[PDB]
Amino acid sequence: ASKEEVPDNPPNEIYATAQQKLQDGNWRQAITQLEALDNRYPFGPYSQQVQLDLIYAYYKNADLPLAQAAIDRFIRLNPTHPNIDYVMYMRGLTNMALDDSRDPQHARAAFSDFSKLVRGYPNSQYTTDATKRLVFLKDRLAKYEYSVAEYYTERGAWVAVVNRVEGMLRDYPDTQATRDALPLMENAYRQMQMNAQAEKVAKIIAANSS
Question: What is 1-210's CATH topology?
Fold first, then answer.
């Protein structure tokens, strides 16, 4: 304690204290220990593990900018580290944490993160809870898009409607909100007198309506 005037002990000892403080749930004191490590022994024997720990502690203490800072640093220096999957997962969580504090760029980021994890490391411990979250994100992101499509319908901006829904079909297919947006697409086409295009959409609606 209590600042990076932590006693001059060798690394394994200070790490041991940090482990303790982490298990006690004492995030603020853990961060003191781990920064003393990061600053004194930047190439230490636990130097990578310290960063993984600092990503955790910063997050639990709600120092989110600090967490993403340490996440991105890490991903850049260690693109193939055996715990890269843990890091991606924490990137997801941190962007969800930020989205939680209407355009949701932070939820978009999270979605992009959990997608990389899931597609890139299908065998990770984290894949399971990451995909459960993607499901949550897909739906909220799609609901936001749909409400923009709903706005443009209101204003008769037919082409804007089509463009929105095309994005929905690409990024968030297999979603309820996307299925509810399809009729907005069909309508926007009929309004532009483009009935051929409208019939094609009507095909898709009919199909997932059985």
Answer: 1.25.40
